[PDB]
């Protein structure tokens, strides 16, 4: 259980490893030590002797006794069991070749060293091909099936062991250190060198192509090993014969899992995009689809039937070894909106890919939200391809994989980085279509994902870059990335603006304290008429006070000024790039966003001097709200409406506002329980402890010079809770639904890492409120020593959302001096920017450590210091986070030093695979309070007679369930695993990747949204419309099918919910008569 490694107690600084072994000779057996305050022994049997002798205190060195402390991690991972460290055995890789018994031996390796580590979920194979020792770490979770095979004749039936893998292994390499090996405080088996993640070492590239591992164990008496530790072991044995897999060798490092060029004119959009996807998903083996018989059969029939049958094949769980038989069964005995829907529903049928470190995993055409480039190029939607780089497990690609990071002396990019660069340059070659790099978005860059486009005959892969307005005369990499990503972020197209309508005004600057500072970085002003026009254009009945635009090549948030008459009044400080597209791209406007704390904000507030036990009251209110949602109607407009982003448009809001209790309708109860679990998990992970007073407002300013330094104007549309109890010491009446904050206000940005970004400004009143009309927006001052948005980390008014809360409970008494926040030098290079440069920028971001790890390092280092956030390590982490944020402007990757690495994590963070310590120091009580809170009927008549009491008896709901309920079941079988019949962006219990949740939920959300819309489209098509005999009849039929016939083989509970708006409206109308 200790892996033969025991941590030592306090030791003298002049401890000698060599003398320790000689002393250990007089203390234990001969050569019983494996590595050398931690000491690792050769066997676990002598550990008990060592542990017992430690209590006797016999060992001593230089008048300082040494004790065996609690068990820690092994110095070098070797399995305690001698028989678990198999040595000098043979490994083969391939696929079962359509028969479960013919292993396609892609490559044979002899001398493989197998280490079946049991305490840690990992299986290690060491391959010494050529002169490099390349480790193969299978990992327990990867294994989908382990089998005892019979490679030889019937004698010695258990002669080989076969491991069916799904995600593929992690391949490493050994590099010389050329440094001293002792360093006082020491292995004995020459375990030098380090593991750098590397692409497949096989020339034929078998490891990528292969989906199974067969181990040729010398003896069959290894039943003790290869057991329930190795997942999915069935006692049934199978006789395995080897074949020749030389026809599957591929020398192209790109896409090492695709077929060959043995196809005449087969359509790739319906076969190659599906057959290869099936191979990657392991529904059919590579030979099962590369055989000429299946290819010819698939070419035989039309593309629609082929796509349907291949989708049905993908719906299967286990491997379909003989797809020819399946296709014959579903074709001979077949029993037998639009592609250009981007302009109508903005949903893409993207051919997303997952380029792992040593493989390719296409996920077929999955429906997702569209974007501007494909919105225009919808004629060639099948040609686009979203390529995401992952880590052989669909998780975030570690910075250790793409770079050595930390004694290294100089960062040397690993072979995975070169593979990423080559696969970006040469491109993905899926048959006839060869996908080339086009561009990426900012969030797309965060997602480790790239957009690729193939050189089509009508449109070339280079012409799209010409159309998008990038890579023509761009001088810096940062502005090239900004231009590439500006038109990819989700934005809606407003009205077109005249070129002469925009009227530039001088940028407001102060230039004090040495560093140059600009007050209005991205603050423009709209005329009232144009503001109204863009209000209808966006879809708002009122006039928002500020709009975050992307009009032209200039990005920023532009307010509404009733005094000015200029149409747009563009700013010169908005300098991003130059473009001729004079169309406003409004992304977000000013909402009264309900406020919610983050862990970094809590840490900074506690550091500044806010009582730690004072946040616990706000979380107590939060958990009182959360615990009374499955039993009380108070959740109707308190949890779903406020804590979750659901607005009044949600069906649950309708059916709770005027409907029954949370425990009445089983569908309502299940949805509210889903929300309960989601909110509890969020609060436990991300301490979104809602502050009732205060909001996250969009940073703006008033161009009229009244507001002074330390003064802010904040107007908020009061919530219902604040409307019921208004007129406090912090609010001042302005209208029936609005009030201006008068008390102290604390302001910080969303990251809020460095202690001092917390600026407790003064909220004041201006007589010119009717002159300006600023609403739901934080008005920063125009004059002063330093711009207030610059104080909040390195923020600026480019559309930033600034934290505000008026509670004296959490307001600091004092400020800490903020950082300089020096601007990023553009560094306009003469060499222009090429595709290779932006590819290098992408790979450099791959190397750069993400903001999440820096934030969690700051949090972990902030709980064990006399000063919570003012610690020196916290300051270095804050500066490094500033550098990482500025990386989008300066091509300098952010590598976190190993000194700031979190060696052990608190219990608030569920980092189970790491040392864990209780965090009773600083806001650690929040996690355990959340844990304590967490660890504490026929309705057919009501659904039908109270809303559609007329006897419909349409009975079309049975047919709908036969096609829409079956569709929901198929959609759930595609990705879901639980009984969530109406997921609606619900968090599935299974988390294969995690680390991707938004992308993973989007696949479930978009499919559920489309299916409900498809059911609504099916419902509308089946509806004959007055809609009394059609809509009410359909609602009543759905209610009868779901609620009255729940015992039937449907188990939907949500088919009436798709049309639930009509049912709820009818119930509300008929509440008078009942």
Length of the chain: 1074
Give the residue nearest to Mg ion (CB).
Answer: 798
| Rounded-to-integer distance, Cα 612 and Cα 810, Å | 10
Backbone dihedral region for residue 710 (phi beyond 0: left; psi -120 to 50: alpha; all else: beta): left
Give the number of residues in contact with Mg ion, rule: CB under 5 A: 2
Q: Which stretch binds Mg ion (CB under 5 A): 284-292, 659-667, 791-799, 856-864?
A: 791-799
Task: Show the tokens assigned to 618.
Answer: 């706000």
Task: Show the tokens assigned to 659.
Answer: 């409907």
Of 206 and 793, the one with the shorter C-beta distance to Mg ion is 793
Please report how close the Cβ of residue 796 comes to Mg ion at its closest, in angstroms.
Answer: 5
Contact between 240 and 216 (Cβ < 8 Å) = no
Of 294 and 523, the one with the shorter C-beta distance to Mg ion is 523
Q: Give strand pairing partners of 436.
A: 453
Q: Which stretch binds Mg ion (CB under 5 A): 459-467, 569-577, 793-801, 940-948?
A: 793-801
Residue 634 is assigned to a ligand binding site: no
The mark string for 621-650 relative to Mg ion (x by CB under 5 A, - otherwise) is ------------------------------
Please report how close the Cβ of residue 588 comes to Mg ion at its closest, in angstroms.
Answer: 13
Strands 759-763, 744-748: parallel, antiparallel or unpaired by DSSP?
A: antiparallel
Task: Show the tokens assigned to 27.
Answer: 């203390």
Please report how close the Cβ of residue 803 comes to Mg ion at its closest, in angstroms.
Answer: 14
SS3 at position 600:
helix
Of 578 and 798, the one with the shorter C-beta distance to Mg ion is 798
Site for Mg ion in 263-292 (CB under 5 A): none
Site for Mg ion in 179-218 (CB under 5 A): none
Contact between 5 and 48 (Cβ < 8 Å) = no
644: Cβ–Cβ under 8 A, 6 or more apart, which residues? 675, 678, 679
∠ CA 489-494-497, nearest 5°, is 115
Please report how close the Cβ of residue 789 comes to Mg ion at its closest, in angstroms.
Answer: 9
Q: Which stretch binds Mg ion (CB under 5 A): 634-642, 762-770, 800-808, 906-914?
A: 800-808
Q: Which stretch binds Mg ion (CB under 5 A): 506-514, 575-583, 790-798, 807-815?
A: 790-798
Please report how close the Cβ of residue 269 comes to Mg ion at its closest, in angstroms.
Answer: 40
Of 435 and 802, the one with the shorter C-beta distance to Mg ion is 802
- Checking 370-373 for CB contacts under 8 A at 24+ apart, the result is 370/342, 370/346, 371/441, 371/487, 371/488, 371/490, 372/487, 372/488, 372/491, 372/493, 372/585, 373/438, 373/439, 373/451, 373/464, 373/468, 373/487, 373/488
Of 781 and 789, the one with the shorter C-beta distance to Mg ion is 789
Of 757 and 800, the one with the shorter C-beta distance to Mg ion is 800
Site for Mg ion in 928-957 (CB under 5 A): none
Task: Show the tokens assigned to 236.
Answer: 């049934």
Cβ neighbours, 10 Å, residue 514: 8
Running DSSP on this structure, what letter comes out for residue 65? B
Contact between 336 and 323 (Cβ < 8 Å) = no
Of 40 and 598, the one with the shorter C-beta distance to Mg ion is 598
Of 206 and 801, the one with the shorter C-beta distance to Mg ion is 801
Q: Which stretch binds Mg ion (CB under 5 A): 101-109, 399-407, 637-645, 795-803?
A: 795-803
Task: Show the tokens assigned to 192.
Answer: 């030098």
280: Cβ–Cβ under 8 A, 6 or more apart, which residues? 257, 359, 360, 361, 362, 363
Q: Is residue 886 near Mg ion by the rule CB under 5 A?
A: no
Task: Show the tokens assigned to 100.
Answer: 């479960």
Of 555 and 960, the one with the shorter C-beta distance to Mg ion is 555
Residue 832 is assigned to a ligand binding site: no
Contact between 175 and 196 (Cβ < 8 Å) = yes
Q: Which stretch binds Mg ion (CB under 5 A): 399-407, 601-609, 713-721, 798-806?
A: 798-806
Q: How far, in whole angstroms, is CA 463 from its chain's centroid?
A: 32
SS3 at position 676:
helix
Please report how close the Cβ of residue 742 comes to Mg ion at its closest, in angstroms.
Answer: 28
| Rounded-to-integer distance, Cα 755 and Cα 643, Å | 27
SS3 at position 896:
coil
Of 750 and 879, the one with the shorter C-beta distance to Mg ion is 750
Closest CA to 46 of 63, 67, 25: 25
The mark string for 827-866 relative to Mg ion (x by CB under 5 A, - otherwise) is ----------------------------------------
Of 270 and 800, the one with the shorter C-beta distance to Mg ion is 800
Please report how close the Cβ of residue 699 comes to Mg ion at its closest, in angstroms.
Answer: 9
Q: Return the H-helix or E-strand segment holding 116.
A: strand 107-117
SS3 at position 223:
coil
Q: Which stretch binds Mg ion (CB under 5 A): 184-192, 368-376, 485-493, 792-800?
A: 792-800
Of 634 and 798, the one with the shorter C-beta distance to Mg ion is 798
Of 256 and 522, the one with the shorter C-beta distance to Mg ion is 522
Residue entry with tokens 């553009």:
826
| Rounded-to-integer distance, Cα 762 and Cα 760, Å | 7
Residue entry with tokens 């015992």:
1047
Cβ neighbours, 10 Å, residue 50: 20
Please report how close the Cβ of residue 792 comes to Mg ion at its closest, in angstroms.
Answer: 10
Q: Give strand pairing partners of 739.
A: 716, 733
Of 556 and 1060, the one with the shorter C-beta distance to Mg ion is 556
Contact between 603 and 569 (Cβ < 8 Å) = no
Q: Which stretch binds Mg ion (CB under 5 A): 491-499, 676-684, 797-805, 810-818?
A: 797-805
Of 821 and 841, the one with the shorter C-beta distance to Mg ion is 821
| Rounded-to-integer distance, Cα 186 and Cα 828, Å | 50
Please report how close the Cβ of residue 591 comes to Mg ion at its closest, in angstroms.
Answer: 18
| Rounded-to-integer distance, Cα 200 and Cα 481, Å | 31
Please report how close the Cβ of residue 579 comes to Mg ion at its closest, in angstroms.
Answer: 20
Cα radius of gyration (the chain):
32
Please report how close the Cβ of residue 478 comes to Mg ion at its closest, in angstroms.
Answer: 14
Closest CA to 821 of 883, 740, 752: 883
Please report how close the Cβ of residue 556 comes to Mg ion at its closest, in angstroms.
Answer: 9
Q: Give the residue, chosen from 100, 129, 682, 798, that forms a contact with Mg ion under the rule CB under 5 A.
A: 798
Please report how close the Cβ of residue 522 comes to Mg ion at its closest, in angstroms.
Answer: 8
Q: Which stretch binds Mg ion (CB under 5 A): 296-304, 587-595, 794-802, 847-855?
A: 794-802
Q: Which stretch binds Mg ion (CB under 5 A): 15-23, 343-351, 442-450, 799-807?
A: 799-807
| Residue 1003: φ, ψ to 5° | -60, -40
∠ CA 752-843-576, nearest 5°, is 60
Letter string b/e over residues 244-280, b meaning 16 or more CB atoms within 10 A of that residue's CB: ebeebbbeebbbbbbbeeebeebbbbbbbbbbbbbbb
Q: Which stretch binds Mg ion (CB under 5 A): 427-435, 510-518, 731-739, 796-804?
A: 796-804
Residue 830 is assigned to a ligand binding site: no
Please report how close the Cβ of residue 531 comes to Mg ion at its closest, in angstroms.
Answer: 22
| Rounded-to-integer distance, Cα 880 and Cα 901, Å | 13
Contact between 756 and 747 (Cβ < 8 Å) = no
**Distance between the two ends of the chain, CA-based, in angstroms?**
67
Please report how close the Cβ of residue 507 comes to Mg ion at its closest, in angstroms.
Answer: 16
The footprint of Mg ion (CB under 5 A) covers 798, 800
Annotated binding-site residues for Mg(2+) read 796, 798, 800
Annotated binding-site residues read 796, 798, 800
């Amino acid at each position: 259980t200790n892996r033969s490694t025991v941590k030592i107690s306090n030791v003298p600084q002049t401890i000698v490893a060599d003398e320790l072994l000689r002393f250990l000779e007089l203390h234990l057996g001969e050569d019983t030590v494996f590595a050398l305050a931690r000491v690792q022994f050769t066997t676990l049997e002598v550990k008990s002797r060592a542990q017992l002798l430690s209590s006797q205190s016999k060992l001593l060195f230089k008048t300082h006794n040494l004790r065996l402390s609690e068990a820690y991690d092994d110095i070098i991972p070797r399995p305690v069991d001698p028989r678990k460290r198999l040595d000098d055995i043979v490994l083969t890789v391939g696929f079962p070749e359509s028969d479960e018994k013919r292993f396609c031996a892609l490559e044979k390796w002899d001398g493989v060293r197998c280490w079946i580590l049991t305490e840690k979920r990992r299986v290690e194979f060491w391959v010494w091909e050529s002169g490099d020792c390349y480790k193969i770490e299978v990992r327990f979770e990867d294994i989908i099936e382990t089998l005892s095979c019979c490679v030889n004749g019937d004698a010695s039936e258990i002669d080989a062991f076969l491991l069916k893998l799904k995600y593929g292994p992690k391949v490493f390499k050994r590099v010389t250190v050329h440094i001293a090996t002792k360093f006082k405080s020491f292995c004995k088996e020459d375990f030098d060198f380090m593991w750098i993640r590397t692409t497949d070492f096989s020339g034929s590239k078998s490891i990528g192509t292969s989906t199974c591992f067969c181990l040729e164990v010398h003896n069959g008496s290894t039943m003790l090993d290869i057991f329930s530790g190795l997942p999915y072991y069935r006692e049934d044995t199978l006789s395995l014969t080897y074949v020749d897999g030389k026809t599957f060798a591929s020398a192209a490092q790109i896409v090492p899992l695709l077929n060959a060029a043995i196809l005449g004119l087969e359509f790739p959009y319906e076969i190659l995009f599906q057959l290869n996807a099936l191979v990657h998903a392991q529904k059919i083996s590579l030979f099962a689809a590369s055989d000429m018989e299946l290819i010819k059969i698939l070419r035989g029939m039309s593309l629609e039937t082929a796509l349907v049958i291949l989708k049905k094949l993908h719906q299967q769980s286990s491997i379909c070894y003989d797809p020819v038989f399946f296709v014959k069964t579903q074709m001979q005995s077949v029993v037998k909106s639009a592609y250009k829907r981007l302009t109508e529903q903005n949903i893409m049928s993207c051919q997303r890919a997952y380029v792992t470190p040593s493989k390719i995993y296409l996920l077929g055409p999955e429906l997702e939200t569209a974007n501007y480039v494909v919105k225009n190029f919808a004629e060639h939607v099948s040609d686009f391809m979203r390529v995401t780089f992952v880590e052989e497990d669909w998780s975030k690609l570690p910075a250790n994989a793409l770079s050595v990071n930390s004694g290294f002396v100089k960062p040397s990019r690993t072979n995975i980085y070169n593979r990423v660069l080559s696969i970006l340059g040469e491109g993905i070659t899926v048959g006839p279509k060869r996908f080339e790099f086009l561009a990426f978005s900012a969030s797309q860059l965060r997602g480790n994902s790239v957009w690729m486009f193939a050189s089509n005959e009508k449109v070339k892969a280079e012409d799209i870059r010409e159309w998008m307005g990038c890579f023509r005369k761009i001088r810096s990499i940062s502005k090239c990335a900004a231009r590439m990503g500006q038109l990819f972020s989700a934005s809606r197209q407003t009205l077109i603006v005249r070129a002469q309508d925009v009227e530039q005004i001088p940028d407001i600057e102060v230039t004090t304290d040495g560093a140059d500072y600009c007050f209005s970085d991205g603050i423009g002003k709209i005329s009232l008429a144009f503001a109204k026009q863009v209000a209808q254009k966006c879809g708002l009945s009122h006039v928002p006070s500020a709009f975050q635009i992307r009009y032209g090549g200039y990005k920023g948030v532009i307010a509404v000024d009733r005094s000015s008459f200029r149409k747009l009044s563009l700013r010169d400080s908005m300098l991003k790039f130059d473009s001729n597209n004079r169309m406003l791209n409004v992304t977000r406007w000013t909402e009264s966003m309900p406020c919610f704390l983050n862990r970094e904000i809590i840490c900074l507030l506690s550091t500044l001097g806010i009582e730690d036990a004072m946040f616990e009251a706000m979380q107590a209110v939060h958990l009182s709200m959360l615990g009374n949602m499955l039993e009380d109607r108070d959740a109707a407009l308190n949890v779903l409406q406020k804590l979750s982003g659901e607005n009044s448009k949600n069906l649950l809001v309708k059916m709770l506002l005027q409907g029954y209790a949370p425990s009445s309708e089983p569908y309502l109860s299940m949805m509210l329980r889903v929300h309960h679990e989601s909110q509890l998990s969020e609060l436990k992970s991300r301490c979104r402890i809602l502050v009732p007073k205060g909001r996250i407002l969009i940073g703006c300013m008033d161009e009229m010079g009244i507001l002074e330094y330390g003064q802010v104007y904040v107007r908020v549309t009061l919530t219902k809770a604040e409307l019921k109890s208004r007129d406090q010491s912090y609010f001042r009446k302005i209208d029936e639904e609005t009030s201006v904050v008068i008390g102290k206000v604390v302001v910080t940005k969303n990251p809020c890492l460095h202690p001092g970004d917390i600026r407790v400004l003064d909220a004041i009143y201006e007589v010119h409120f009717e002159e300006k009309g600023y609403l739901d927006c934080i008005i920063f001052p125009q004059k002063g020593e330093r711009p207030h948005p610059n104080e909040c980390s390195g923020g600026d008014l480019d559309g930033d959302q600034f934290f505000v809360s008026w509670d004296e409970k959490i307001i600091p008494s004092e400020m800490d001096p903020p950082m300089d926040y020096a601007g990023s030098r553009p560094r306009l290079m003469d060499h222009d920017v090429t595709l290779e440069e932006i590819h290098k920028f992408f790979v450099d971001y791959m190397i750069s450590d993400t903001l999440g790890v820096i934030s969690t390092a700051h949090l972990v280092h902030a709980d064990r210091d006399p000063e919570k956030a003012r610690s020196q390590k916290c300051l270095e982490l804050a500066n490094l986070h500033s550098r990482a944020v500025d990386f989008a402007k300066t091509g300098a990757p952010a590598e976190m030093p190993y000194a700031l690495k979190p060696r052990e994590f608190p219990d608030f963070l569920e980092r189970f695979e790491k040392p864990t310590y209780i965090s009773e120091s600083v806001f650690g009580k929040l996690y355990r309070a959340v844990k304590s809170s967490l660890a504490q009927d026929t309705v057919a008549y009501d659904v039908t007679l109270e809303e559609a009491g007329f006897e419909s008896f349409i009975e079309t709901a049975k047919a709908h369930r036969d096609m829409y309920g079956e569709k929901l079941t198929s959609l759930m079988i595609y990705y879901g695993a639980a009984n969530e019949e109406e997921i609606l962006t619900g968090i599935l219990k299974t988390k294969e990747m995690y680390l991707n949740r938004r992308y993973g939920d989007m696949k479930d959300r978009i499919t559920l949204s489309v299916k409900d819309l498809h059911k609504e489209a099916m419902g509308w098509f089946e509806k004959s419309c007055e809609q009394q005999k059609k809509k009410l009849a359909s609602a009543w039929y759905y209610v009868t099918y779901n609620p009255n016939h729940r015992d039937e083989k449907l188990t939907f509970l949500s088919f009436p919910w798709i049309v639930g708006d009509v049912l709820l409206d009818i119930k509300a109308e008929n509440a008078q008569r009942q």
